[PDB]
């Protein structure tokens, strides 16, 4: 199937004066907001609500300093808000920021038995904040064992009769929690659908939110244009017709990983890699013969233009483009003097390809390995180790030590990869089955444990839950590396959750792309 965008994003001219107009007013709105944070004499509930709203509006990235300092004090000053609402929110914010706040704060809301007091089933704002908090738990938070089921069942019961926009905020939460959703996608929904219709809205913050979102969108649109040009200048739609045309979608993913303007170069470098490996994938999946794929795999491992001759003409195209890309990366990084870090991404790509070849081998033989062995190859084929490594390329502050840490397959990274694999397998199962892919995960899980499809998918679901608790734990201080390098990994897992919601294709991404890159927010 072809791209349904056309050349809609191929050309974008920024309204220079509009940008300056917005940028100038934002600085003023930025200062007003800062003073709202640096403000003195505020209740706990009010301070946490301020932080939460600024974050949901997608503007918190301007007050990384301010918000941190405030949450730090709250952590240290351990409060006693007998309000479920403020407690759950206090818990979530701190946890999301790496503050290992004790889950004992919830015991006051549950009986001797250790279960949530059902007397709270009429505190909708409490249930909602508890619901959101339930997704930020780790393995040491069994006190929150049934917080999801509890808050969920009562919110569903309450929802139909709630006033707007609360009703829509709740209904949306039940379909997509905040912690596991894509930042820009959730920010878009909050600004446009909730806060804008909020009667108690703060006009300074709402205007600040809309202007910023729209200004960043102009930046994103410029980037997607440069990329759409770069992709067009390669012309893989006529030269390599078996490969998918999804550069726009590949950009949405780079955007899910990070949206900040400071990560402009990284995001562009990333989208290029995602698009490139997207071709290599289709090369192993739809086209290419066994004999052909081994030569491709082999050439990638050697990594030298001298190997092109050994490859069929069509694989010569892909292969040459791959080295040029990494050649382009080294040049961009030359200025900063970080040109050397490119090798890390390269070594990961080889790993993906090496495993792509293995995947096809298993397909031909009709091999159905045990889960242990299956995952030993299937994890890298998610490309997440490769994408996460690529993430650091454009991040001007990423050091050799950071790449060093990442190369050891840290648990947070490992968990992100597992979520991707597991979710993908549950969704694409029924499809790949009919294609003769008896090498799929759910198939291996059924043959290994001697269980049905449901049980297998259930076992996989638990693997993703375990994986999320691990990501949440991996964010707690002291973090192995700066949070700056953990977020991309966190975002990769969120993208998976967002793409395979309810485990269909670009039909799921279309609305997000329109709301994020096509339509601007009406002021
Ligand atoms: C599970 C997904 C789609 C999560 C979103 C992020 C992502 C993986 C970005 C990289 C792009 C790729 C997508 C391949 O998608 P698809 O061809 O369906 O995979 P499969 O052939 O292994 O089933 C690549 F081709 F590179 F593998
Ligand atoms: Mg594939
Ligand atoms: Mg799959």
From Swiss-Prot:
**Impact of mutating residue 352 to I?**
Relaxed product specificity leading to equal amounts production of 5-epi-aristolochene, 4-epi-eremophilene and premnaspirodiene with cis,trans-farnesyl diphosphate as substrate
State the Gene Ontology terms under molecular function. 5-epi-aristolochene synthase activity; magnesium ion binding; terpene synthase activity
Q: What else is known?
A: PubMed:1438319 indicates the presence of at least two genes coding for the same protein.
Quote the protein name from its UniProt record: 5-epi-aristolochene synthase
Name the UniProt key words of this record, in alphabetical order: Cytoplasm, Lyase, Magnesium, Metal-binding
Share what the entry says about its subunit structure, partners included: Monomer.
Q: Write the lineage as a comma-separated list.
A: Eukaryota, Viridiplantae, Streptophyta, Embryophyta, Tracheophyta
Reported effect of changing residue 492 to I? Catalyzes the conversion of (2E,6E)-farnesyl diphosphate to (+)-5-epi-aristolochene and triggers self-alkyation of D-424 leading to enzyme inactivation
Question: Which PANTHER family does this UniProt record tie to the protein?
Answer: ALPHA-HUMULENE_(-)-(E)-BETA-CARYOPHYLLENE SYNTHASE, OS04G0344100 PROTEIN-RELATED
GO terms of biological process kind: diterpenoid biosynthetic process; sesquiterpene biosynthetic process
Catalytic activity reads: (2E,6E)-farnesyl diphosphate = (+)-5-epi-aristolochene + diphosphate; (2Z,6E)-farnesyl diphosphate = (+)-2-epi-prezizaene + diphosphate; (2Z,6E)-farnesyl diphosphate = (-)-alpha-cedrene + diphosphate; (2Z,6E)-farnesyl diphosphate = (-)-beta-curcumene + diphosphate
**Pathways per UniProt:** Secondary metabolite biosynthesis; terpenoid biosynthesis
Name what cofactor the protein needs: Mg(2+)
Q: What is the effect of changing residue 384 to F?
A: Catalyzes the conversion of (2E,6E)-farnesyl diphosphate to (+)-5-epi-aristolochene and triggers self-alkyation of D-424 and Y-500 leading to enzyme inactivation
